[model samples]
Target: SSFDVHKKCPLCELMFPPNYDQSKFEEHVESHWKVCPMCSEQFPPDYDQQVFERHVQTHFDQN
Candidate 1:
């Protein structure tokens, strides 16, 4: 019921935990983003550098 204590995914309707805040959520979202080992910078969650090796079989599911 308390939406404040969680983070919600915009595209798929997925909600995260520990609600009610501002910048903390921003930091939390980074976990899902890209961590380019090539530079060690926190990037947007656009590539799957892990098992997928940033290789998309069909270019995103929504493609």
Candidate 2:
């Protein structure tokens, strides 16, 4: 078995694979949300768990 690093885009609700890097993921997420890639979208930078969960569900369903 292997570990997987999962990430999601809050705006588009897109799920990224395990190999996804945080810096690159953040960049894509920000771009999707039309926000500055260099700055955090929300104060304290809260991860959108709800959207991420939904995306995960869809991801599983697709397979």
Candidate 3:
């Protein structure tokens, strides 16, 4: 049987496997990290959103 093909990841260009679990793809992307918009710095995937926002705010405040 032929497995379904999926599109390559936008960020990393890694191809998705057959049956293509989106969660796996999200996890892979998560490893790439949730980054700051201001500085574009990558932070831990599980990092607190408020803390991350505060960090970005600090950048704006210092500017």
lDDT of each: 0.55, 0.58, 0.77
Write candidate 2's Cα lDDT for 1-62 as tens digits. Answer: 77665676766768898888889987776665422223333322355656555555555566
Model 1 misplaced regions, further than 4 Å: 1-7, 11-19, 37-39, 47-63
Where model 2 places Cα greater than 4 Å from the true spot, the runs are: 1-5, 35-63
What TM-score would every model get versus the actual structure?
0.39, 0.41, 0.46
Q: What TM-score does structure 2 among the candidates reach? A: 0.41
The per-residue C-alpha lDDT of model 3 at residue 48 equals 88
> RMSD in angstroms, all models?
9.6, 14.7, 7.3
Which candidate, 2 or 3, has the higher lDDT? Answer: 3
Among residues 3 or more apart in sequence or in different chains, the pairs in candidate 3 whose N, CA or C atoms overlap within 3 Å are: none
- lDDT of candidate 3 over 7-43, digit per residue (tens): 5766677887777788888768766777777887777
- Which residue pairs clash within candidate 2? none
Best by TM-score: 3
Clashing pairs in 1: 4-19, 4-20, 5-18, 5-19, 5-20, 6-19
RMSD of 3: 7.3
